[PDB]
Amino acid sequence: GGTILVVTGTGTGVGKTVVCAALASAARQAGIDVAVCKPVQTGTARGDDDLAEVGRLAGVTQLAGLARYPQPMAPAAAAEHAGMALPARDQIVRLIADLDRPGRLTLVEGAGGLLVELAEPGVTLRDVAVDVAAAALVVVTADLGTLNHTKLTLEALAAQQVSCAGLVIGSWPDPPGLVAASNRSALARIAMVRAALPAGAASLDAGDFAAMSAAAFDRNWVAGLV
Amino acid sequence: GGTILVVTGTGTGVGKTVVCAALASAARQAGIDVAVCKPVQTGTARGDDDLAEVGRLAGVTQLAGLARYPQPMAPAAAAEHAGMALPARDQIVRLIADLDRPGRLTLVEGAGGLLVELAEPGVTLRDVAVDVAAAALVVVTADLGTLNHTKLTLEALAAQQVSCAGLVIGSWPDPPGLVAASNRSALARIAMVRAALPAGAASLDAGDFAAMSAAAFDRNWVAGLVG
Ligand SMILES: Nc1ccn([C@@H]2O[C@H](COP(=O)(O)OP(=O)(O)OP(=O)(O)O)[C@@H](O)[C@H]2O)c(=O)n1
Ligand SMILES: Nc1ccn([C@@H]2O[C@H](COP(=O)(O)OP(=O)(O)OP(=O)(O)O)[C@@H](O)[C@H]2O)c(=O)n1
Ligand SMILES: [Mg+2]
Ligand SMILES: [Mg+2]
Structure with missing residues (x-):
């Protein structure tokens, strides 16, 4: 096997997908082979498609999905609205383990x-991460409330002995502002901030x-991933 | 003592203060005595005063603060920005215990x-809840993301054997969209939904x-909060 990383977030719209793309681009530039799996995609009527965003921004071609x-x-x-079940746990876990290989960083976006x-x-990304022995990269915001949400997520991670690979601030505002600046330091007191991606x-x-x-x-961390 | 509820939430801005006032009002109209406590209060330079707002909406006169x-x-x-320090855990707990009294419902907003x-x-409202043996009423949204936040919060509550007294949807839009209605059902499957306060x-x-x-x-749940 290689390295499987699940990329989760404290909520929706925290820029999980752009973080997947950014980490992918970095890892590829380290000459690491990247695959990204998004098992289930919603919002497809309006063109929601997070694997496509990873393709465009980072040029990943190993882009794997099961349901839209x-x-x-x-x-x-x-x-429920569409009238069809979710995928099975087995489909997800085995698609992911089949993407994984030596030399490859496999990012999994929930x-x-x-x-x-x-x-x-009722199985979650946390369960999936357990089944494939992946660590979790937690994408966070810099906004008021991120501290509570982060501590909650890291606690849920630890409760199932899922390792925490670090935090990424999905969107760093410009100019930062007092709250966001203070939060970035506080965040650095609970886990390793790996990056803060400029807003936009x-x-x-x-x-x-x-x-x-x-x-x-x-660069050393990225390389050190695989 | 009496009954202590911490009134917590899935995040900031979810309606904790308004729920304190609404439950206080309903318990008062049931003849139950209510104290509301707000131990750590931020944003005072902007006129944020949650105790005053409970008093304004519910007429609760038994309001207790501590740090501002x-x-x-x-x-x-x-x-850190005021040059001040946070209170100690026992100062917060002391403030709550002095309010507690048989027949009284004491709400503690975080x-x-x-x-x-x-x-x-790193002392939280959860540690405080364990200290004063309170149950937690968890205020949630109806918005996308609320199921995850709610489950995370309940998991953190059960991690320390702090009992969940139920959820309250802080702001319930009229009419509810597809997302609101769906979330309300799922929340009803995760924990007792005690009320869903209308928006505004x-x-x-x-x-x-x-x-x-x-x-x-x-009515029966409110009456059952205090014997
Ligand atoms: N540094 C960043 C971070 C986020 N975004 C943008 O802000 C939104 C949120 O980012 P996204 O990655 O789509 O959200 P996710 O965390 O993946 O949430 P979800 O998949 O649940 O929608 C996107 O429209 C994205 O275009 C951005 O432009 N620059
Ligand atoms: N059913 C509701 C709930 C909230 N509000 C309004 O929405 C905002 C947030 O409600 P609030 O109770 O103040 O949120 P809190 O959880 O108390 O946020 P915090 O304690 O972190 O300040 C307030 O402006 C309040 O007037 C409302 O009109 N009707
Ligand atoms: Mg996404
Ligand atoms: Mg409040």
Whole structure:
């Protein structure tokens, strides 16, 4: 096997997907092979497609998915609305373990936060991370409330002996502001901040995104991933 | 003693203060004596005073505060920015125990979500809840992401054997969209949903707010909070 990382977040819209892309771009620039798996995608009627974003921003081609629900709802809600079950636990775990290989960094993007339902019956990204021995990268905000949400997520991680690989601030505002600046230090007191991605990066072209990503993570850590 | 409920939430801004007032109002109309306590209060330089707001909506006169910081930040940050310190754990617990009394419902509103630091070192409303043997009423949203936040919070409550007294949806939109309705059902499957306060409730005057409050909760549950 190689390195499987699950990329989770304290909530939805924290920039989990752009963090996947940024880490992918960095790791690829370290000459590491990257695959990204998004098992379940919602919001497909309006063009939600997080694996496509990873393809565009980072040029990952190993992009693996199992289900697409039109509604921009939580997966189980989208499933109920669409009239179809979620994927099975086995489908998810085995698709992921089949992507994994020596030399490869495999990022797994859930939907929303850590405890949202991803497969039948009521199994979460946390469970998946356990089944494949992956660590968790926690994408966080710099906004008021991020501390509570982070401590909650790291506690849930530890409760199932899922390791915490660090935090990434999904979107670093400009100018920061007093609350965001204070939160970045506090966040650094509970886990290793790996990067803070400038707000708006999702709009860069691939060259600029690759440059951003190269400068956002510690190169030694990234290399040290696989 | 009496009954102590901590009134916590899935995050900041979810409606904790308004729930304190609404449950206080319903319990008062049931003839139950209510104290509301706000040990760590931030944002005073912006006029944030949660105790005053409970008094304004519910007429609760038995309001107890302790620490007040000017900036609208996490208490640790507001304290560091004012040149002040956070209270000690036993100061907070002392404040709560002095209110407790047979026949009284004592609501304790936190600062933000359950794991915010209230006292050094890293003392939270959960530790305080264990100290005063309270149950936790968890205020949640109907918005996308609320299931995850709710489950995380309950898991953190059960981690220390702090009992969950139920959830309250702080702000319930009328009409509820697809996302709101769905979340309300799922929340009803995770824990007892005790009330779902209508959005904008802070705009109702004394009589309308008291009507809303009594209708919001199960009469039997409110009466059952205190013997
Ligand atoms: N440094 C960043 C971080 C986020 N975004 C943008 O802010 C939004 C949130 O980021 P996204 O990665 O899509 O959200 P996720 O955390 O993956 O949440 P979910 O998959 O549940 O939608 C996106 O529209 C994205 O374009 C950005 O432009 N620059
Ligand atoms: N049913 C409700 C709930 C909230 N509000 C309003 O929405 C905002 C948030 O409600 P509040 O109780 O103050 O949120 P809190 O959880 O108390 O936020 P915090 O304690 O962190 O300040 C307030 O402006 C309040 O007037 C409302 O009108 N009707
Ligand atoms: Mg995403
Ligand atoms: Mg409040």
